[PDB]
Curated annotation (Swiss-Prot):
Signal peptide: none annotated. It comes from Homo sapiens. Probable kinase that may be involved in a calcium-signaling pathway controlling neuronal migration in the developing brain. May also participate in functions of the mature nervous system. This is Serine/threonine-protein kinase DCLK1. Induction: Up-regulated in response to enterovirus 71 (EV71) infection (at protein level). The gene is DCLK1. Residues 4-90 form the Doublecortin domain.
């Protein structure tokens, strides 16, 4: 209720429909800690295999540099080595994940 919820996708991955992260001082006190956790949750042997290196806005036009740039209910794209790939990441994903808890 009091945490900032955002939804992370994987760059160039047309199938994964995102994971919700609760961002609060209590859960991620630092940017590096957030990226390390994103690698743990999202990086596998074929999807972002080198690890998460970058968080993009949904349009791919900005790389996030600080936790305050993350906005409640917005969606972000985790990138690794390849540049941002424009996909309809959020299509058909109901926004209730950002409303009821």
């Amino acid at each position: 209720k009091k945490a900032k919820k955002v939804r992370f996708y994987r760059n160039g991955d047309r199938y994964f429909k995102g994971i919700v992260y609760a961002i609060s001082p209590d859960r991620f006190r630092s940017f590096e800690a957030l990226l390390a956790d994103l690698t743990r949750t999202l990086s596998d042997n074929v999807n972002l295999p080198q690890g998460v290196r970058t968080i993009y806005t949904i349009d791919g036009l900005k790389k996030i540099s600080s936790l305050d740039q993350l906005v409640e209910g917005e969606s972000y794209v985790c990138g690794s080595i390849e540049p941002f790939k424009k996909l309809e990441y959020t299509k058909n994903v109901n926004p209730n994940w950002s409303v009821n808890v």
